[PDB]
Amino acid sequence: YQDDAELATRAIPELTKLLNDEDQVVVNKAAVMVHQLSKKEASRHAIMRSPQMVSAIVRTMQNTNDVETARCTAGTLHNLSHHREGLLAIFKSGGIPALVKMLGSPVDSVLFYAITTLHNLLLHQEGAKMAVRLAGGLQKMVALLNKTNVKFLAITTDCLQILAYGNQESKLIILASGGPQALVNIMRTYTYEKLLWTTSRVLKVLSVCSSNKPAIVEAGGMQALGLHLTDPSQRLVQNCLWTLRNLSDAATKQEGMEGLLGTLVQLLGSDDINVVTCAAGILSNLTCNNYKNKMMVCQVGGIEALVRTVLRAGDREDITEPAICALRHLTSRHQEAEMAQNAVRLHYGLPVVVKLLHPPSHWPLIKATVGLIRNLALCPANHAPLREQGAIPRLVQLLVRAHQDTQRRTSMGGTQQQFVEGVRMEEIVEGCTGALHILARDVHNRIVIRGLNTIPLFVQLLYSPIENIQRVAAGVLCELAQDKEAAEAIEAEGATAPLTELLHSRNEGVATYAAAVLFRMSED
């Protein structure tokens, strides 16, 4: 060894001379020796530290198409990339643009030497990201996703993950290169844990993108990610779940979701809190405005599973909020909505749902819960139970608070109206009044509502500048007007004047309810 870092050093200028030889026959001889001088502790640091070498070696690899020297050279750089000095040395000689050129090599051993070295550079060499992007490694790597060696694909997809992370430039190019569809293809074809994991990471990164999102969805990403939710690997399952939650708001138009939806429902009974949370989140977005998904979730026991999720979550609002939102979506506008409304009651959900209206619940959960209660009230069998649990007094109380807050802002807190815990009080005013409108279909509920002296407030809400509020207020007043005593109170309260003006509202809903109140009040 005492002559390695002494003779090889005096040998460096030697082989370096041969690598630049014009004779395409002996240049191969050095390539072999040089490669050998990459396996010894000394020779390695000899060439690696010999800028002259690195440069020639790199130039050789790319130039000589000789399917024999291409690997000796490529094989040299790779041995150097296991050392920081090597990575840096390779980076300075411009090896990256070369290595990227070799990604097109039909000689597997060269291909493998290229992708593994680039991976090392992208993993520990600052500046590598720019260079690879510069040389156009992105489109190259996306093209190589058509290969079938799984360890190779795992390396390649990891590189793409490194290059894409937090960079829309790379992401755009990946998209244009047809990356999404290729990535989804891998998820539905292979079973090599490491590969699925690394690929799910690239998808996770792209799923937070605006342009990549709808692309992954169209490629069938939802269904494919859904294939691995039952896999033994926890990191794979969790990565698929996060990516799925990100895509879920742009996948409300997909077909063949039966399998995914059924799996999500069963995932609600998981021992892992994090899986439960994501699952509820994903179901909430997939059942928003999609009657088909709503019918499916209900069909596989979604209602019972969600009520159980709410019970198990306790005071953990990151779980109850989306679970309660899903339940809201499932209890209206679809063929089985009525079955869903009944099932919530049959599975002992009414008590827990009304309790959520009380502290320690914060506003976002409260807002979601008021909406669910409005839907539950569409089922006449839920009126007495909802009333027994104290729903009306709490809804009215919430209504009064939110309305006053909007009054302490009619002056100037900041702007027209801002938020409180992420919720505008105008939405609580609308939600509560809307819940009371439906509940008021019941004669007994009307007695309670009227008894709390709400008519004066409801009338003032007709002057609200917010159309949706004017509409639910007129709505609840119309329901209450069917009782003579309430009808006289509404009139004594001066509702006729404002109702008469609302007949001209630009909002059909508002004009209709206003007119309905007046008719109910006329023909008594």
Binding site: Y113, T116, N149
Partner: peptide, 17 residues
């Protein structure tokens, strides 16, 4: 002698698991 697939197998062995 050595299968040009050991290059990947080895790499994977060190970068991750």
């Amino acid at each position: 002698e050595e299968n040009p697939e050991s290059i990947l197998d080895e790499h994977v062995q060190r970068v991750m698991k």
